[PDB]
Design an enzyme around this catalytic site. Sequence first.
Site, mmCIF file in Angstrom:
data_model
loop_
_atom_site.group_PDB
_atom_site.id
_atom_site.type_symbol
_atom_site.label_atom_id
_atom_site.label_comp_id
_atom_site.label_asym_id
_atom_site.label_seq_id
_atom_site.Cartn_x
_atom_site.Cartn_y
_atom_site.Cartn_z
ATOM 1 N N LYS A 83 34.587 34.320 41.226
ATOM 2 C CA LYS A 83 34.492 32.908 40.871
ATOM 3 C C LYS A 83 34.227 32.026 42.094
ATOM 4 O O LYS A 83 33.394 31.115 42.036
ATOM 5 C CB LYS A 83 35.766 32.478 40.140
ATOM 6 C CG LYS A 83 35.895 30.986 39.902
ATOM 7 C CD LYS A 83 36.655 30.739 38.589
ATOM 8 C CE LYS A 83 38.138 30.479 38.801
ATOM 9 N NZ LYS A 83 38.834 31.359 39.788
ATOM 10 N N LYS A 94 39.245 22.277 44.412
ATOM 11 C CA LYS A 94 40.148 23.348 43.987
ATOM 12 C C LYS A 94 41.572 22.823 44.096
ATOM 13 O O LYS A 94 42.238 23.020 45.125
ATOM 14 C CB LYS A 94 39.959 24.627 44.805
ATOM 15 C CG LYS A 94 40.773 25.775 44.259
ATOM 16 C CD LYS A 94 40.062 27.119 44.345
ATOM 17 C CE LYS A 94 40.876 28.198 43.631
ATOM 18 N NZ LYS A 94 40.351 29.579 43.866
ATOM 19 N N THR A 142 46.074 29.980 45.480
ATOM 20 C CA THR A 142 47.155 30.870 45.846
ATOM 21 C C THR A 142 46.579 32.025 46.639
ATOM 22 O O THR A 142 45.369 32.100 46.869
ATOM 23 C CB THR A 142 47.874 31.389 44.603
ATOM 24 O OG1 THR A 142 46.946 32.169 43.828
ATOM 25 C CG2 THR A 142 48.367 30.226 43.772
ATOM 26 N N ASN A 171 35.232 41.439 25.301
ATOM 27 C CA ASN A 171 36.522 40.963 24.822
ATOM 28 C C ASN A 171 36.953 39.712 25.567
ATOM 29 O O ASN A 171 37.290 38.691 24.953
ATOM 30 C CB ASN A 171 37.576 42.055 24.998
ATOM 31 C CG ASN A 171 38.912 41.664 24.430
ATOM 32 O OD1 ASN A 171 39.002 41.230 23.277
ATOM 33 N ND2 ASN A 171 39.969 41.806 25.231
ATOM 34 N N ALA A 229 26.165 42.043 44.081
ATOM 35 C CA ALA A 229 27.379 42.464 44.758
ATOM 36 C C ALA A 229 27.184 42.404 46.272
ATOM 37 O O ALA A 229 26.098 42.695 46.786
ATOM 38 C CB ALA A 229 27.754 43.879 44.335
ATOM 39 N N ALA A 258 27.473 39.598 48.117
ATOM 40 C CA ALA A 258 26.975 38.302 48.570
ATOM 41 C C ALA A 258 27.985 37.527 49.414
ATOM 42 O O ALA A 258 27.585 36.608 50.136
ATOM 43 C CB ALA A 258 26.552 37.444 47.377
HETATM 44 N N1 LIG Z 1 28.223 38.448 43.928
HETATM 45 C C1 LIG Z 1 29.462 38.673 44.641
HETATM 46 C C2 LIG Z 1 30.767 38.299 44.028
HETATM 47 C C3 LIG Z 1 32.041 38.542 44.759
HETATM 48 N N2 LIG Z 1 32.009 39.148 46.073
HETATM 49 C C4 LIG Z 1 33.237 39.386 46.840
HETATM 50 C C5 LIG Z 1 33.861 38.284 46.996
HETATM 51 C C6 LIG Z 1 35.299 38.657 47.009
HETATM 52 O O1 LIG Z 1 35.646 38.990 48.299
HETATM 53 C C7 LIG Z 1 35.364 39.887 46.042
HETATM 54 C C8 LIG Z 1 35.609 39.407 44.549
HETATM 55 O O2 LIG Z 1 36.931 38.970 44.412
HETATM 56 O O3 LIG Z 1 34.243 40.434 46.108
HETATM 57 C C9 LIG Z 1 30.713 39.506 46.687
HETATM 58 O O4 LIG Z 1 30.706 39.990 47.767
HETATM 59 N N3 LIG Z 1 29.445 39.261 45.960
#
Ligand SMILES: Nc1ccn([C@H]2C[C@H](O)[C@@H](CO)O2)c(=O)n1
EC number: 6.3.3.3
Lengths: 227, 226
Positions: B16, B38, B42, B148, B199, B201
Site C-alpha cells: 500500500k 498518513k 505503526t 475473497n 515486485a 519497486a
Molecule cells: N510493487 C512493489 C510493492 C511492495 N514492495 C515492497 C515494499 C515493502 O517493503 C514490501 C511490501 O510490504 O515489499 C516492492 O518492493 N514493490
Amino acid sequence: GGTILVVTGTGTGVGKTVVCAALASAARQAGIDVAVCKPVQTGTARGDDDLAEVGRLAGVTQLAGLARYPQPMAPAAAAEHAGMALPARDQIVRLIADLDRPGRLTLVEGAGGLLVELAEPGVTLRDVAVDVAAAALVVVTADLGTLNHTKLTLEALAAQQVSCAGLVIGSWPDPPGLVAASNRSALARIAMVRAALPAGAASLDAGDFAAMSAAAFDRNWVAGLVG
Amino acid sequence: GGTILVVTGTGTGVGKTVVCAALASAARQAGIDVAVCKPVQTGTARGDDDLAEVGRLAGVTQLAGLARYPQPMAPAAAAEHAGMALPARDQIVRLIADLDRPGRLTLVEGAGGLLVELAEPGVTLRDVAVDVAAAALVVVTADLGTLNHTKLTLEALAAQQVSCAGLVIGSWPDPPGLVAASNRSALARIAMVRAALPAGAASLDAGDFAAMSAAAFDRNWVAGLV
Ligand SMILES: Nc1ccn([C@H]2C[C@H](O)[C@@H](CO)O2)c(=O)n1
Ligand SMILES: Nc1ccn([C@H]2C[C@H](O)[C@@H](CO)O2)c(=O)n1
C-alpha cells in the site's frame, strides 16, 4: 433436523480443515454424531483432500464430497482450467440436507474464504448458510491483519443475517508473541473465541489429537451445539 | 476544494505505501499537486516511517501525520501497548480537510486494513472516508485469497456508500504464476484495475521509481483525478 455449522476462514491457509477435525473430534467424544461435508475441493492434483485429512485426524467416517478440481486455485478458476463447471447451488444444498438429521452435528467446510464463489453465479458459502439456516464458525489467525479480516468477515455474515457461531484461532503459537497475545484479547472483544488450537496439531496422532481437541473447546459449548 | 482519495489495503504487507508513492509520483508527473496524509502509522521502530518513504520514492513534500507507534500492531493495539490514546476522529478529519485545495490530489493512507480502528472510539478509515466525502482506492495482492478479501472490502465500502476508485495490485510477481495470472483477470471483473506494480519497486532510486510509476498508471485516469 440437526445442527448445521458452516466452517469458514478469514483467509486461505488459516487452519480451517484442522479446526473442522478438532471440532468433530470434540463433538464425537461428547457422544454427538458428526458428519463433515466439503462441497468444493480444489488442488486435488497436488493431493489436497480435506475430507480425507478430517478422517485421518479425527476418525470421522461420514464424509461427503461433491466437486473435486485438480488445480490449487479458487474454485471458479480451478473449474475453468479443467474444462469443468461449478456445481449448482441446489446441488450443494441437497448434499448438506441429505446429511442433516436430529442429534447430528453437520460441518460444512468452505473453500478458502467466506465470499469465494462456489456456484454460479457468484453463489458463496454465505448464500449456502442462508439456504440451510446454518450459523458460521469463523477460523482466524493471531497475526497482524487478523482484526481487519475478521471484522470484514463478520460484517459480511451479519449483512445476510447469518449468525456467527464464534471464532477459532486456527493455529496458536507456543509461546505466544507480543502481537499474538494482543490480537487474541482483541479478537475476544469482537466475538467469542471458542478455541485456539496449538500449532502443529496436524502432526499429532489420533490419541493426541483427540486429547488436544477435547481440551480446546468448552465442553458446555460443544454439548450445547445439538439437543 | 480538490480531490481527497483514501488508499486502503485488503491487508498488511500488500504494497500500500508503495502504491501511494506510485500514484503520487504519477500524479506529480501529470502536473498535479500531491499531498500524502498518513494520520496514524505503526511498526515504525521496526521498518520505515511510511511518509518518509513516499518522500524518498516520489518526492512529495506535503507529508502529514499525527501519531507513530513503534510496535508492529494495529493502531488500537499499538496505542494500548504504548499507553497513549489514538488521535480523535475530529483531528484526523480536520487535518485532511485543511490539506484539501483545488488542483491538489490529497492521498489519505490507511494503517493496515479498511476496518482497522484508526481513532477512538472505534472510528475507522471507512468512517473518515465518509466525513471527507472521499472515494477509496483498494490495494490488493495477486495471490490466492485476494478475491475473497477484495469482495469483502468492496462490500464494506458499499455498506456505507463509500465509492470505490478501483483496485491496484500492490506487488505483481515475476514470473506471474498460474494463480496470479488468473486473479489479475478475475479482479478486473469485480472492479477497474488501475495498475499492477512490479515486485521490487521499493528498491528503485527516485528516477527509476518515477519511470515505473508513469508507466504503471493510465495517464488519462490520473489526470482526471483532479
Ligand atoms: N510493487 C512493489 C510493492 C511492495 N514492495 C515492497 C515494499 C515493502 O517493503 C514490501 C511490501 O510490504 O515489499 C516492492 O518492493 N514493490
Ligand atoms: N493448529 C494447526 C493449524 C494448521 N496446521 C497445519 C495444517 C496445514 O497444513 C497448515 C494450515 O493450512 O498448517 C497444524 O499443523 N496445526
